Design a protein around this ligand. Sequence first.
Ligand SMILES: NC(=O)c1ccc[n+]([C@@H]2O[C@H](COP(=O)([O-])OP(=O)(O)OC[C@H]3O[C@@H](n4cnc5c(N)ncnc54)[C@H](OP(=O)(O)O)[C@@H]3O)[C@@H](O)[C@H]2O)c1
Ligand SMILES: Nc1nc(=O)c2nc(CNc3ccc(C(=O)N[C@@H](CCC(=O)O)C(=O)O)cc3)cnc2[nH]1
Length: 159
Amino acid sequence: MISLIAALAVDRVVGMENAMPWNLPADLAWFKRNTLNKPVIMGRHTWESIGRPLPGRKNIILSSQPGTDDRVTWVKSVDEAIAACGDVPEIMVIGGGRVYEQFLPKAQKLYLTHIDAEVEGDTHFPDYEPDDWESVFSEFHDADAQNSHSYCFEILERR
Ligand SMILES: NC(=O)c1ccc[n+]([C@@H]2O[C@H](COP(=O)([O-])OP(=O)(O)OC[C@H]3O[C@@H](n4cnc5c(N)ncnc54)[C@H](OP(=O)(O)O)[C@@H]3O)[C@@H](O)[C@H]2O)c1
Ligand SMILES: Nc1nc(=O)c2nc(CNc3ccc(C(=O)N[C@@H](CCC(=O)O)C(=O)O)cc3)cnc2[nH]1
């Protein structure tokens, strides 16, 4: 199946011009846990943000131009991205906004982190129609000495 993973501020905000104004190591650990040993599909702006290949995962970058880094795989369409993943139990779509919108209609699972933060952003997670999604796991954590904001992990499945 296809899954999306994202961290959402209030108002579904996922990105802005610069890095997001939060320090959330427990969320990063969650991201790493849920993506290791799976292929990850991302857009070019997300690739540039991350700044390097994510280790232990097949990295697939969407761009309409030829690749500029021979360490990862570069594709020019949603279908080509999916084919490049091969025969796996779970493909992870890791953003950003333009990519999440394209893959949400194909997805069977969402891994969301809801962060209690107000951030004016320019990039949003797509609207996910309630009738089409069921929540299967939730876990709340408060802000603390190592995490700047409170964070609630959720996993939803399509219905
Ligand atoms: N809080 C979070 O979870 C989270 C997660 C991921 C990303 N983000 C943030 O999201 C922002 C990036 O989102 P974004 O929407 O600006 O960019 P994006 O989705 O990372 O990348 C967009 C680029 O991807 C390529 N692309 C996408 N779909 C394509 C298709 N069907 N065919 C060919 N190429 C395709 C295009 O590259 P070309 O222009 O080369 O054609 C396009 O300009 C960043 O600020 C990042 O930090 C936040
Ligand atoms: N829940 C979640 N949180 C995120 O921060 C997030 N970020 C993206 C896009 N950006 C990034 C930026 C950096 C790293 C990164 O460096 N990850 C490391 C672990 C970080 C650590 O150990 O400190 C990795 O190996 O996954 C991942 C995704 C996509 N979905 C997400 N989803």
